[PDB]
Every structure is written in C-alpha cells, then in structure tokens.
Short mmCIF file of C-alpha atoms in Angstrom, two decimals:
data_model
loop_
_atom_site.label_atom_id
_atom_site.label_comp_id
_atom_site.label_asym_id
_atom_site.label_seq_id
_atom_site.Cartn_x
_atom_site.Cartn_y
_atom_site.Cartn_z
CA UNK A 10 -0.07 -0.04 -0.01
CA UNK A 11 2.89 2.08 1.21
CA UNK A 12 4.70 1.63 -2.29
CA UNK A 13 1.44 2.05 -4.01
CA UNK A 14 0.72 5.45 -2.70
CA UNK A 15 4.28 6.45 -3.54
CA UNK A 16 3.81 5.20 -7.33
CA UNK A 17 0.28 6.75 -7.63
CA UNK A 18 1.81 10.30 -6.48
CA UNK A 19 4.66 9.80 -9.24
CA UNK A 20 2.03 8.76 -11.93
CA UNK A 21 -0.24 11.63 -11.09
CA UNK A 22 2.87 14.15 -11.40
CA UNK A 23 3.95 12.56 -14.65
CA UNK A 24 0.59 12.84 -16.21
CA UNK A 25 0.60 16.57 -15.13
CA UNK A 26 3.77 17.37 -16.71
CA UNK A 27 3.29 15.39 -19.90
CA UNK A 28 -0.26 16.54 -20.36
CA UNK A 29 -0.10 18.01 -24.20
CA UNK A 30 -0.25 21.72 -24.59
CA UNK A 31 0.38 22.20 -28.42
CA UNK A 32 -1.24 19.59 -30.20
CA UNK A 33 1.78 17.95 -30.97
CA UNK A 34 2.27 13.99 -31.75
CA UNK A 35 5.57 14.53 -29.86
CA UNK A 36 3.78 15.52 -26.71
CA UNK A 37 1.34 12.28 -27.17
CA UNK A 38 4.44 10.15 -27.67
CA UNK A 39 6.35 11.41 -24.55
CA UNK A 40 3.23 10.68 -22.45
CA UNK A 41 2.51 7.30 -24.04
CA UNK A 42 6.44 6.23 -23.28
CA UNK A 43 6.07 7.59 -19.82
CA UNK A 44 2.79 5.78 -18.81
CA UNK A 45 3.13 2.38 -20.91
CA UNK A 46 4.46 0.72 -17.74
CA UNK A 47 7.42 0.80 -15.60
CA UNK A 48 7.87 -0.60 -11.97
CA UNK A 49 9.07 2.82 -11.15
CA UNK A 50 11.95 1.62 -9.01
CA UNK A 51 13.90 4.68 -9.47
CA UNK A 52 11.48 7.35 -8.01
CA UNK A 53 10.39 4.72 -5.44
CA UNK A 54 13.90 4.71 -4.09
CA UNK A 55 14.31 8.47 -4.08
CA UNK A 56 11.12 8.74 -2.36
CA UNK A 57 11.57 5.95 0.09
CA UNK A 58 15.13 7.40 1.04
CA UNK A 59 13.82 10.77 1.58
CA UNK A 60 11.03 9.55 3.83
CA UNK A 61 13.81 7.53 5.88
CA UNK A 62 15.63 11.17 5.89
CA UNK A 63 12.81 13.34 6.75
CA UNK A 64 13.21 15.55 3.45
CA UNK A 65 10.64 17.95 2.24
CA UNK A 66 8.19 15.85 0.10
CA UNK A 67 7.94 18.37 -2.88
CA UNK A 68 11.54 18.65 -3.64
CA UNK A 69 11.80 15.05 -3.20
CA UNK A 70 8.87 14.41 -5.74
CA UNK A 71 10.69 16.75 -8.11
CA UNK A 72 13.73 14.67 -7.95
CA UNK A 73 11.99 11.34 -8.31
CA UNK A 74 9.84 12.54 -11.21
CA UNK A 75 13.06 13.92 -12.87
CA UNK A 76 14.76 10.56 -12.71
CA UNK A 77 12.01 8.71 -14.13
CA UNK A 78 11.44 11.21 -17.10
CA UNK A 79 15.23 10.97 -17.66
CA UNK A 80 15.08 7.13 -17.61
CA UNK A 81 11.86 7.00 -19.98
CA UNK A 82 13.85 9.25 -22.38
CA UNK A 83 17.01 6.76 -22.25
CA UNK A 84 14.66 3.90 -23.11
CA UNK A 85 13.31 5.78 -26.20
CA UNK A 86 16.64 6.40 -27.68
CA UNK A 87 17.96 2.96 -27.00
CA UNK A 88 14.97 1.35 -28.70
CA UNK A 89 15.66 3.45 -31.87
CA UNK A 90 16.47 1.54 -34.96
CA UNK A 91 20.26 2.61 -35.13
CA UNK A 92 20.69 1.44 -31.58
CA UNK A 93 18.81 -1.41 -30.37
CA UNK A 94 15.95 -1.32 -32.98
CA UNK A 95 13.26 -2.72 -30.53
CA UNK A 96 9.79 -3.26 -31.77
CA UNK A 97 8.46 -3.66 -28.37
CA UNK A 98 9.04 -1.92 -24.90
CA UNK A 99 6.89 -3.07 -21.84
CA UNK A 100 5.03 -5.58 -23.93
CA UNK A 101 3.53 -2.55 -26.02
CA UNK A 102 4.93 -1.39 -29.38
CA UNK A 103 7.81 0.88 -29.00
CA UNK A 104 7.70 4.72 -29.34
CA UNK A 105 9.01 4.80 -32.80
CA UNK A 106 6.86 1.83 -33.98
CA UNK A 107 3.87 3.78 -32.76
CA UNK A 108 4.62 7.33 -33.93
CA UNK A 109 7.50 7.21 -36.36
CA UNK A 110 11.27 7.45 -35.85
CA UNK A 111 11.22 11.12 -36.27
CA UNK A 112 8.80 11.69 -33.61
CA UNK A 113 10.29 9.25 -31.26
CA UNK A 114 13.63 11.01 -31.33
CA UNK A 115 12.03 14.33 -30.52
CA UNK A 116 10.28 12.62 -27.79
CA UNK A 117 13.34 11.31 -26.13
CA UNK A 118 14.96 14.76 -26.31
CA UNK A 119 11.73 16.47 -24.89
CA UNK A 120 11.71 13.99 -21.91
CA UNK A 121 15.56 14.83 -21.19
CA UNK A 122 14.81 18.52 -21.36
CA UNK A 123 11.67 18.18 -19.06
CA UNK A 124 13.80 16.04 -16.47
CA UNK A 125 16.47 18.93 -16.25
CA UNK A 126 13.43 21.37 -16.02
CA UNK A 127 12.23 19.54 -13.13
CA UNK A 128 15.43 19.40 -11.48
CA UNK A 129 15.98 23.15 -11.99
CA UNK A 130 12.78 23.70 -10.02
CA UNK A 131 14.61 22.44 -6.89
CA UNK A 132 16.95 25.43 -6.89
CA UNK A 133 19.96 23.33 -5.33
CA UNK A 134 23.08 23.80 -7.54
CA UNK A 135 24.72 20.80 -6.17
CA UNK A 136 21.71 18.60 -7.27
CA UNK A 137 22.08 20.41 -10.63
CA UNK A 138 25.49 19.63 -11.11
CA UNK A 139 25.33 15.95 -9.96
CA UNK A 140 22.42 15.26 -12.12
CA UNK A 141 24.11 16.85 -15.14
CA UNK A 142 27.20 14.79 -14.35
CA UNK A 143 24.82 11.73 -14.01
CA UNK A 144 23.41 12.38 -17.49
CA UNK A 145 26.89 12.74 -19.17
CA UNK A 146 27.85 9.44 -17.44
CA UNK A 147 25.00 7.51 -18.69
CA UNK A 148 25.38 8.72 -22.23
CA UNK A 149 28.95 7.56 -22.07
CA UNK A 150 27.82 4.20 -20.71
CA UNK A 151 25.43 3.78 -23.69
CA UNK A 152 28.10 4.90 -26.11
CA UNK A 153 30.47 2.15 -24.76
CA UNK A 154 27.77 -0.57 -24.97
CA UNK A 155 27.02 0.43 -28.72
CA UNK A 156 30.91 0.68 -29.41
CA UNK A 157 31.96 -2.40 -27.82
CA UNK A 158 29.41 -4.36 -29.76
CA UNK A 159 30.13 -2.95 -33.20
CA UNK A 160 33.83 -1.91 -33.18
CA UNK A 161 36.55 -4.37 -33.62
CA UNK A 162 38.09 -3.61 -30.38
CA UNK A 163 39.71 -5.27 -27.39
CA UNK A 164 37.31 -5.14 -24.53
CA UNK A 165 38.79 -6.08 -21.03
CA UNK A 166 36.63 -7.09 -18.05
CA UNK A 167 37.37 -3.79 -16.45
CA UNK A 168 35.97 -1.94 -19.34
CA UNK A 169 32.82 -3.87 -19.27
CA UNK A 170 32.29 -3.50 -15.45
CA UNK A 171 32.90 0.28 -16.13
CA UNK A 172 30.38 0.30 -18.78
CA UNK A 173 27.82 -1.01 -16.38
CA UNK A 174 28.66 1.50 -13.78
CA UNK A 175 28.09 4.34 -16.27
CA UNK A 176 25.21 3.11 -18.29
CA UNK A 177 23.12 1.58 -15.22
CA UNK A 178 25.09 2.47 -12.16
CA UNK A 179 25.01 6.37 -12.46
CA UNK A 180 21.27 6.84 -12.35
CA UNK A 181 21.01 4.60 -9.35
CA UNK A 182 24.14 6.58 -7.89
CA UNK A 183 22.06 9.79 -8.16
CA UNK A 184 18.89 8.25 -6.62
CA UNK A 185 20.94 7.13 -3.64
CA UNK A 186 22.75 10.71 -3.43
CA UNK A 187 20.21 13.12 -4.18
CA UNK A 188 18.20 12.65 -0.73
CA UNK A 189 21.42 13.26 1.13
CA UNK A 190 22.19 16.26 -0.84
CA UNK A 191 18.69 17.48 0.02
CA UNK A 192 19.25 16.82 3.39
CA UNK A 193 22.57 18.55 3.61
CA UNK A 194 24.48 15.32 4.41
CA UNK A 195 27.55 14.10 2.86
CA UNK A 196 26.61 12.12 -0.12
CA UNK A 197 29.79 10.54 -1.19
CA UNK A 198 29.37 7.00 0.15
CA UNK A 199 25.72 6.66 -0.66
CA UNK A 200 26.82 7.66 -4.35
CA UNK A 201 29.17 4.81 -4.45
CA UNK A 202 26.71 2.46 -2.95
CA UNK A 203 24.03 3.34 -5.59
CA UNK A 204 26.60 2.79 -8.27
CA UNK A 205 27.29 -0.87 -6.91
CA UNK A 206 23.46 -1.45 -6.63
CA UNK A 207 23.01 -0.22 -10.46
CA UNK A 208 25.74 -2.72 -11.36
CA UNK A 209 24.05 -5.69 -9.42
CA UNK A 210 20.77 -4.37 -10.92
CA UNK A 211 22.16 -4.69 -14.46
CA UNK A 212 23.61 -8.09 -13.91
CA UNK A 213 20.56 -9.43 -12.71
CA UNK A 214 18.81 -7.98 -15.81
CA UNK A 215 21.19 -9.84 -17.85
CA UNK A 216 20.38 -13.13 -16.06
CA UNK A 217 16.67 -12.36 -16.29
CA UNK A 218 17.01 -11.79 -20.26
CA UNK A 219 18.69 -15.26 -20.46
CA UNK A 220 15.87 -16.88 -18.58
CA UNK A 221 13.37 -15.05 -20.56
CA UNK A 222 14.94 -16.12 -23.86
CA UNK A 223 13.64 -19.59 -22.82
CA UNK A 224 27.40 -9.02 -30.75
CA UNK A 225 26.69 -7.25 -27.39
CA UNK A 226 29.53 -7.42 -24.54
CA UNK A 227 27.83 -8.31 -21.22
CA UNK A 228 29.54 -9.22 -17.94
CA UNK A 229 27.80 -12.62 -18.16
CA UNK A 230 29.29 -13.33 -21.46
CA UNK A 231 32.88 -12.23 -20.12
CA UNK A 232 33.10 -13.92 -16.72
CA UNK A 233 30.21 -16.54 -16.94
CA UNK A 234 26.93 -16.82 -15.04
CA UNK A 235 28.43 -18.32 -11.85
CA UNK A 236 30.98 -15.38 -11.29
CA UNK A 237 28.67 -12.61 -12.68
CA UNK A 238 25.89 -13.73 -10.13
CA UNK A 239 28.54 -13.83 -7.26
CA UNK A 240 29.58 -10.39 -8.08
CA UNK A 241 25.85 -9.16 -8.39
CA UNK A 242 25.17 -10.82 -4.90
CA UNK A 243 28.24 -9.62 -3.35
CA UNK A 244 27.56 -6.02 -4.24
CA UNK A 245 23.90 -6.40 -3.26
CA UNK A 246 24.98 -7.49 0.21
CA UNK A 247 27.27 -4.64 0.46
CA UNK A 248 24.41 -2.28 -0.58
CA UNK A 249 22.08 -3.69 2.51
CA UNK A 250 24.74 -3.62 5.09
CA UNK A 251 25.28 0.08 3.99
CA UNK A 252 21.66 1.04 3.82
CA UNK A 253 21.19 -0.64 7.37
CA UNK A 254 24.19 1.10 8.76
CA UNK A 255 22.77 4.43 7.89
CA UNK A 256 19.62 3.48 9.66
CA UNK A 257 17.54 3.77 6.39
CA UNK A 258 14.96 1.15 7.35
CA UNK A 259 12.02 1.85 4.69
CA UNK A 260 14.81 1.80 2.15
CA UNK A 261 16.35 -1.45 3.64
CA UNK A 262 12.78 -3.23 3.50
CA UNK A 263 12.25 -1.78 -0.27
CA UNK A 264 15.56 -3.38 -1.38
CA UNK A 265 14.92 -6.81 0.66
CA UNK A 266 11.67 -6.91 -1.34
CA UNK A 267 13.20 -6.06 -4.74
CA UNK A 268 15.87 -8.82 -3.71
CA UNK A 269 13.21 -11.35 -3.07
CA UNK A 270 11.35 -10.91 -6.36
CA UNK A 271 14.81 -11.36 -8.07
CA UNK A 272 15.28 -14.53 -6.13
CA UNK A 273 11.78 -15.89 -7.11
CA UNK A 274 12.80 -15.67 -10.85
CA UNK B 28 40.35 41.43 -34.00
CA UNK B 29 37.92 41.91 -30.97
CA UNK B 30 35.54 39.22 -32.48
CA UNK B 31 38.44 37.18 -33.12
CA UNK B 32 39.96 37.00 -29.73
CA UNK B 33 36.34 36.21 -28.32
CA UNK B 34 35.79 33.42 -30.89
CA UNK B 35 39.27 32.02 -30.18
CA UNK B 36 38.56 31.73 -26.42
CA UNK B 37 35.47 29.99 -27.18
CA UNK B 38 37.12 27.53 -29.73
CA UNK B 39 39.72 26.80 -26.92
CA UNK B 40 37.31 26.04 -24.37
CA UNK B 41 35.22 23.95 -26.91
CA UNK B 42 38.43 21.90 -27.63
CA UNK B 43 39.04 21.36 -23.84
CA UNK B 44 35.62 20.13 -22.99
CA UNK B 45 35.51 17.86 -25.96
CA UNK B 46 38.96 16.43 -25.71
CA UNK B 47 38.07 12.58 -25.75
CA UNK B 48 39.05 10.76 -22.51
CA UNK B 49 37.42 7.28 -23.10
CA UNK B 50 38.64 6.15 -26.97
CA UNK B 51 34.91 6.51 -27.84
CA UNK B 52 34.09 7.22 -31.70
CA UNK B 53 31.22 9.12 -29.88
CA UNK B 54 33.48 11.68 -28.41
CA UNK B 55 35.48 12.09 -31.68
CA UNK B 56 32.16 12.84 -33.29
CA UNK B 57 31.17 15.47 -30.84
CA UNK B 58 34.54 17.09 -31.12
CA UNK B 59 34.08 16.89 -35.12
CA UNK B 60 30.82 18.48 -35.00
CA UNK B 61 31.69 21.36 -32.63
CA UNK B 62 34.77 22.36 -34.49
CA UNK B 63 33.71 21.65 -38.54
CA UNK B 64 32.70 25.27 -38.51
CA UNK B 65 30.43 27.85 -37.01
CA UNK B 66 30.33 31.47 -37.18
CA UNK B 67 29.85 31.30 -33.66
CA UNK B 68 27.22 34.06 -33.43
CA UNK B 69 25.56 33.01 -30.17
CA UNK B 70 28.58 32.78 -28.24
CA UNK B 71 29.83 36.00 -29.50
CA UNK B 72 26.49 37.66 -28.40
CA UNK B 73 26.71 36.39 -24.95
CA UNK B 74 30.37 37.47 -24.64
CA UNK B 75 29.78 40.97 -26.07
CA UNK B 76 26.71 41.66 -24.06
CA UNK B 77 28.43 40.55 -20.89
CA UNK B 78 31.63 42.91 -21.76
CA UNK B 79 28.96 45.75 -22.08
CA UNK B 80 27.66 45.01 -18.79
CA UNK B 81 30.92 44.10 -17.05
CA UNK B 82 30.10 40.56 -16.05
CA UNK B 83 32.65 38.34 -14.79
CA UNK B 84 34.45 36.70 -17.74
CA UNK B 85 34.52 33.13 -16.43
CA UNK B 86 30.82 32.78 -15.75
CA UNK B 87 30.07 34.47 -19.18
CA UNK B 88 32.62 32.20 -21.02
CA UNK B 89 30.75 29.12 -19.38
CA UNK B 90 27.36 30.33 -20.75
CA UNK B 91 28.64 31.18 -24.18
CA UNK B 92 30.21 27.62 -24.64
CA UNK B 93 26.92 26.06 -23.03
CA UNK B 94 24.95 27.81 -25.77
CA UNK B 95 27.30 26.66 -28.64
CA UNK B 96 27.44 23.04 -27.27
CA UNK B 97 23.66 22.97 -27.23
CA UNK B 98 23.38 24.60 -30.75
CA UNK B 99 25.80 21.99 -32.09
CA UNK B 100 23.56 19.22 -30.68
CA UNK B 101 20.57 20.58 -32.06
CA UNK B 102 22.20 20.65 -35.69
CA UNK B 103 23.47 17.09 -35.31
CA UNK B 104 19.94 15.78 -34.48
CA UNK B 105 18.31 17.95 -37.11
CA UNK B 106 20.49 16.58 -39.90
CA UNK B 107 19.54 12.82 -39.06
CA UNK B 108 18.06 10.59 -41.57
CA UNK B 109 14.48 10.74 -39.90
CA UNK B 110 14.47 14.31 -39.59
CA UNK B 111 16.21 16.53 -42.30
CA UNK B 112 18.46 13.90 -43.53
CA UNK B 113 21.26 16.07 -44.60
CA UNK B 114 24.24 14.60 -46.26
CA UNK B 115 26.39 17.82 -45.46
CA UNK B 116 26.90 20.44 -42.67
CA UNK B 117 28.95 23.45 -43.00
CA UNK B 118 30.53 22.29 -46.50
CA UNK B 119 31.71 18.85 -44.56
CA UNK B 120 30.09 15.51 -44.50
CA UNK B 121 27.18 15.39 -41.64
CA UNK B 122 27.92 13.57 -38.35
CA UNK B 123 26.05 10.54 -39.30
CA UNK B 124 27.76 10.46 -42.82
CA UNK B 125 31.02 10.23 -40.99
CA UNK B 126 30.42 8.21 -37.92
CA UNK B 127 27.14 6.47 -38.31
CA UNK B 128 23.66 7.11 -37.43
CA UNK B 129 24.04 5.41 -33.97
CA UNK B 130 26.93 7.34 -33.21
CA UNK B 131 25.59 10.75 -34.33
CA UNK B 132 22.50 10.24 -32.30
CA UNK B 133 24.67 9.61 -29.09
CA UNK B 134 26.96 12.52 -29.94
CA UNK B 135 23.97 14.82 -30.08
CA UNK B 136 22.76 13.60 -26.75
CA UNK B 137 26.30 13.99 -25.24
CA UNK B 138 26.45 17.49 -26.44
CA UNK B 139 23.34 18.67 -24.95
CA UNK B 140 24.48 16.83 -21.53
CA UNK B 141 27.55 18.67 -21.70
CA UNK B 142 25.67 22.04 -22.25
CA UNK B 143 23.86 21.44 -19.18
CA UNK B 144 26.83 20.43 -17.31
CA UNK B 145 28.57 23.82 -18.39
CA UNK B 146 25.58 25.75 -17.21
CA UNK B 147 25.45 23.97 -14.01
CA UNK B 148 29.27 25.27 -13.13
CA UNK B 149 27.87 28.69 -12.87
CA UNK B 150 25.77 28.03 -9.74
CA UNK B 151 22.88 30.36 -10.86
CA UNK B 152 19.57 28.69 -10.21
CA UNK B 153 17.84 31.44 -12.37
CA UNK B 154 20.23 30.58 -15.25
CA UNK B 155 19.66 26.85 -14.77
CA UNK B 156 16.01 27.48 -14.98
CA UNK B 157 16.05 29.70 -17.96
CA UNK B 158 18.34 27.41 -19.92
CA UNK B 159 16.14 24.44 -19.23
CA UNK B 160 12.99 26.21 -20.31
CA UNK B 161 14.76 27.29 -23.38
CA UNK B 162 15.83 23.74 -24.22
CA UNK B 163 12.23 22.57 -24.04
CA UNK B 164 11.11 25.36 -26.18
CA UNK B 165 13.68 24.85 -28.90
CA UNK B 166 12.52 21.08 -29.05
CA UNK B 167 8.85 22.30 -29.28
CA UNK B 168 9.72 24.37 -32.17
CA UNK B 169 11.60 21.57 -33.91
CA UNK B 170 8.65 19.21 -33.37
CA UNK B 171 6.26 21.90 -34.74
CA UNK B 172 8.60 22.27 -37.87
CA UNK B 173 8.49 18.54 -38.51
CA UNK B 174 4.96 17.89 -37.68
CA UNK B 175 3.59 20.87 -39.74
CA UNK B 176 5.53 19.40 -42.84
CA UNK B 177 4.49 15.89 -42.39
CA UNK B 178 0.84 15.89 -41.00
CA UNK B 179 -2.10 16.69 -42.84
CA UNK B 180 -2.98 19.47 -40.68
CA UNK B 181 -4.26 23.36 -40.88
CA UNK B 182 -1.18 25.55 -40.19
CA UNK B 183 -1.83 29.15 -39.55
CA UNK B 184 0.30 32.26 -39.96
CA UNK B 185 0.38 32.49 -36.18
CA UNK B 186 1.34 28.88 -35.85
CA UNK B 187 4.45 29.37 -38.35
CA UNK B 188 5.49 32.42 -36.45
CA UNK B 189 5.36 30.63 -33.00
CA UNK B 190 7.19 27.99 -34.43
CA UNK B 191 10.13 30.42 -35.36
CA UNK B 192 9.92 32.06 -31.97
CA UNK B 193 10.57 28.63 -30.39
CA UNK B 194 12.85 26.63 -32.63
CA UNK B 195 15.17 29.83 -33.21
CA UNK B 196 14.20 32.70 -31.34
CA UNK B 197 14.15 30.86 -27.86
CA UNK B 198 18.10 30.33 -27.89
CA UNK B 199 18.75 33.85 -28.90
CA UNK B 200 16.26 34.99 -26.14
CA UNK B 201 18.44 33.26 -23.74
CA UNK B 202 21.73 34.67 -25.18
CA UNK B 203 20.18 38.14 -24.66
CA UNK B 204 18.85 37.39 -20.95
CA UNK B 205 21.63 35.37 -19.58
CA UNK B 206 24.09 38.30 -19.33
CA UNK B 207 21.50 40.33 -17.55
CA UNK B 208 20.67 37.65 -14.93
CA UNK B 209 24.34 37.31 -14.23
CA UNK B 210 24.61 41.00 -13.73
CA UNK B 211 21.34 40.69 -11.25
CA UNK B 212 19.29 43.15 -13.58
CA UNK B 213 15.68 42.34 -14.82
CA UNK B 214 15.93 40.16 -18.03
CA UNK B 215 12.29 40.21 -19.26
CA UNK B 216 12.66 43.04 -21.88
CA UNK B 217 15.84 41.68 -23.11
CA UNK B 218 14.57 38.05 -23.52
CA UNK B 219 11.66 39.35 -25.66
CA UNK B 220 14.05 41.29 -27.64
CA UNK B 221 16.30 38.28 -28.25
CA UNK B 222 13.24 36.26 -29.28
CA UNK B 223 12.54 38.90 -31.84
CA UNK B 224 16.13 39.03 -33.21
CA UNK B 225 15.81 35.22 -33.63
CA UNK B 226 12.67 35.33 -35.64
CA UNK B 227 14.13 38.13 -37.86
CA UNK B 228 17.51 35.65 -38.06
CA UNK B 229 15.46 32.83 -39.25
CA UNK B 230 13.75 34.77 -41.83
CA UNK B 231 17.00 35.98 -43.10
CA UNK B 232 18.05 32.36 -43.12
CA UNK B 233 15.11 31.39 -45.32
CA UNK B 234 16.01 34.07 -47.60
CA UNK B 235 19.44 33.08 -48.06
CA UNK B 236 18.36 29.49 -48.62
CA UNK B 237 16.34 30.64 -51.48
CA UNK B 238 19.29 32.90 -53.00
CA UNK B 239 21.61 29.83 -52.23
CA UNK B 240 19.36 27.56 -54.08
CA UNK B 241 20.26 29.49 -57.28
CA UNK B 242 6.68 20.00 -47.70
CA UNK B 243 8.39 22.46 -45.19
CA UNK B 244 6.17 25.38 -43.85
CA UNK B 245 8.35 28.59 -43.64
CA UNK B 246 7.08 32.27 -43.15
CA UNK B 247 8.22 33.11 -46.67
CA UNK B 248 5.99 30.38 -48.20
CA UNK B 249 3.12 31.76 -45.95
CA UNK B 250 3.07 35.59 -46.23
CA UNK B 251 5.67 35.97 -49.26
CA UNK B 252 8.98 37.11 -49.48
CA UNK B 253 8.27 40.91 -49.46
CA UNK B 254 6.16 40.62 -46.18
CA UNK B 255 8.57 38.28 -44.53
CA UNK B 256 11.47 40.43 -45.29
CA UNK B 257 9.46 43.55 -43.88
CA UNK B 258 8.67 41.61 -40.74
CA UNK B 259 12.53 40.71 -40.14
CA UNK B 260 13.51 44.23 -40.89
CA UNK B 261 11.21 45.77 -38.44
CA UNK B 262 12.05 43.27 -35.67
CA UNK B 263 15.70 44.05 -36.70
CA UNK B 264 15.14 47.59 -36.06
CA UNK B 265 13.07 46.92 -32.76
CA UNK B 266 16.39 44.97 -31.55
CA UNK B 267 18.88 47.66 -32.47
CA UNK B 268 16.57 50.48 -30.76
CA UNK B 269 16.44 48.43 -27.74
CA UNK B 270 19.98 47.45 -27.46
CA UNK B 271 21.09 51.07 -27.98
CA UNK B 272 18.53 52.23 -25.47
CA UNK B 273 20.25 49.97 -22.85
CA UNK B 274 23.62 51.63 -23.77
CA UNK B 275 25.02 48.06 -25.01
CA UNK B 276 27.35 49.81 -27.64
CA UNK B 277 29.53 46.66 -28.17
CA UNK B 278 26.48 44.66 -28.81
CA UNK B 279 25.02 47.33 -30.98
CA UNK B 280 28.03 47.43 -33.45
CA UNK B 281 28.16 43.68 -33.48
CA UNK B 282 24.45 43.68 -34.52
CA UNK B 283 25.01 46.22 -37.12
CA UNK B 284 28.04 44.33 -38.51
CA UNK B 285 25.66 41.11 -38.80
CA UNK B 286 22.98 43.23 -40.65
CA UNK B 287 25.36 44.82 -43.13
CA UNK B 288 26.41 41.10 -44.01
CA UNK B 289 23.00 40.10 -44.32
CA UNK B 290 22.38 43.21 -46.46
CA UNK B 291 25.56 42.24 -48.80
CA UNK B 292 23.86 38.77 -49.84
#
C-alpha cells in the first residue's frame, strides 16, 4: 500500500507534466512512453530514502519525477532503429513503431529536457551539478555498449564493468545521493553504494534476459553466469549492509523486497 | 580582432571540454561536429553583451560555451535521416555520414548533456531554470517544424510565427537574457528582444536558402518574400533600438555588422 501511494503520486505528477499543450504528436509520444508501464523502482528509491531522512516531500517528488522522465527518455533512444531497434517496450509497441522514428527521436529529447526542467525547480546547485554529471555518464555508458558491440576492439573485463557502472550505475548513484544532498548530508558514500546497486541491478537484468529467452558485450558473457551472479550478490549484500548502517529502514525493506523478487525468478 | 579574440577563447574552451577521454568514436564525433565550422554568433553575442555589462568573464564564457554546445547538438539531431537527412553540414560531411547514425544520435545527446553540465558550473539557479526552459522550447519548435511538414493539418500564420519564436528565437532570447541575469538586472525585456532577433534571424536564413538554391512550412511560403522581409527588418530595427537604449554599444556594433553582412547577400 505504502509503495502504491508513492507510485500513484509519481504517476499523477508525470501525467501533469506530460499533458499535451500544443497539439503535437511529439507530446502524445512522450506521454505514451512515460505511462506504458514501468515498475518505477528509481522514483520509489528516491521517495523512500527521502522519507527515511525526513526530506521535504515537494523537492523529493521533483527529484523522483526527474529521474523517471530521464529514464523514460533513455529507453526511447535505446529502442531506436540505429541503436537496439526494439519493436516492443513493456509488451507494447515501441515509441518509434507507434509514432515514427522522427517523432520518437524528438520525444526522447523532450523528456530529457523536461527532466532537467524538473531538477531546476529545486533551486539546489549541487543537485543540478550531480544530475548533469549523471546524464553525461549514462551517455558515455550507452556509447560504450554500442561501440564495444560494433567496433573491432579489445574489450577487457574492467571496461565492461565500467560500462555497467556508467550505463546503469550512474542513475542509481544519483537516486541514492540526491536525498542526502537535499538533507545537507555528505553523499559520497551513498553515491558509491548506489553505483554498486546499479551494477548488481544490470547483472540481474542480464540473467533475467537469459531466463526470458527460454554482438553485445555483457558481464555474463565475459566472466560467466556463476561469477557474474557472485559479483551481483556481493554488491547487493554490501548495499544492504550500508543502507542498514545508515538507519534507512524503509529503504532497507524496499531493497529486500526487490531482492526477493529477483530470487523468485 | 575583437570578435576574433572572443571566438578563439570559445574555440579553445570547446576543444578542452570535447577532448576525448574514453577512446570513443562518440567523443570524436562530438568534437568533429563542434569544430567543423560555425560563425559562433550565439557565443559572440553572450560575450559581447557581458562585456557591455561588465560581467565576470569566467561565468560568461561558461554560458557562451553552453549555448554553442547546445546549438551543435541541435544541428546533429536535425541532420539525422528521420529528420532532415542532411548529407552535409558547413560544407563537410554530416556527423552521421562520417560516424554512423548510431554514433551521431549519441553525440547529439552527449553535447546537450555537456551543455547542461557547463551551465551547472555557474551555480545560478535562475540561469539553470531559464536554460532548461529554453531547451524545451527549442524542442517544441523543432517538433512543430517536423509535424507541420508531415501531418495533414491546418497551419495558420500565427502557428508558423510561434514555431520560429520557439525553434530559433528561444536560444537567442537566452543569449540576450543570460548576461542580464548574471548582472542581477531584470531580463524580461531583453529576453523578448532576443526572441525577436531570432525570428528575424530565421527569416533571413530562409531568404538566404532561396538565394543559395540559385513540404516545409516557412514564413516566406506563408506571407511571401516581401512581407517576410518587412517583418524581419522591422524586428531587427526594434532590436537595434532596444540595444542602443540600454547603452550596450559593443553589442549594438556587433548587430550592425551582422545586419550589413545580411544586406550584402
């Protein structure tokens, strides 16, 4: 019920921000992509951490919505024909399949810009800086994924692990960090913990994709299923220990529930 | 010499920011696009206005570089095959023709993110807010241009004029505004003046494209060459009067020089 109340608040704000104003297919596409589904783990983490810390709900919801809009945009661009060429996303036709590649490209851009606009509402320069740094890292990570796949190049294990930390880890690092910055607490350790969480999250995604299936450089391909799973499990344990040590009990239980869901796959 | 010193400083900062660090083709592509050419009118306006106002040079150069990186990114995405499908840009092969559509898409995204990162360095929330609002407007303008062309829809003259004000006017509005915000002066009138300047700028671009040539909804197509040119000339006169009235003499002379160049086409 807890998680539901939080998700409903996020859904409502997303619908407000993305309500078309200019009779554009591009607006409709942004709204489509943002509402087709999503477990909303990223905004849920932000909101739950902020509750644990007692951060003002309005600034926290602005962060949570920003992260989700950004996430949405990143999936639109990843799905595009030049990149991953996904016909489907969340069991629904992809943005470009629904609206055209032109409209989908623009929708992705719009969503990123709206994400920055939400962050800017907070009026906290450190959050603006961190979010901007996070965006660029995510981009670097996506570029590495594309290039590692498509270039004839040497790709070390360390390079794959960095690509995970950038492509997936950076946005979780921000989710873990941003509530601490809003509280006026040092966020350096939480940022690293969030990055580890994101790496573990990506690994569990790789493993799900294998089970679901019943070129791309993945950590599972590089080190094997057993080692990859060991790395993910270890990082996840570190995250749980770190979260408990900070006394963040709502967040701890949220992370335990996510872990049980992974375990039940 | 004046304009040259300023442009060289911009070129140098752009090369610093875009110096690759990760051995990525995406990094190389961002640098390629940002350095293939450009008259650098947008950063030159920012730097010149800031000089007239006596604004601290470091914060001003961060704004100027941000605007140019953003501009660069917007041209990469416009050129892409789903949008305008340009084989050339500044007389050089386009980003996607040089590096691939995947790499070009990512380069555009990277440049926008770097632009926001530069803005965030300033530590001024009003600048962050204005820049973010500007980005979204520019996106709306591009969407309108694409959709007006491709949809079977009624497009009024007012809609075309709004599309100009968003697609081209918004970024100039920001260039005119940002130095006033950095000075702690009310920027509302300068923002409107910059928007008018951008509309006139777009119209002169339309007219150049006709002369150069010796579907898309343009103001020239809607109202005709004579009326369009009259609108541009009138807006430009308003801008010159407004700039002189604020005592911004370096900027006034820069704008007169740009106008003479247009006149000599």
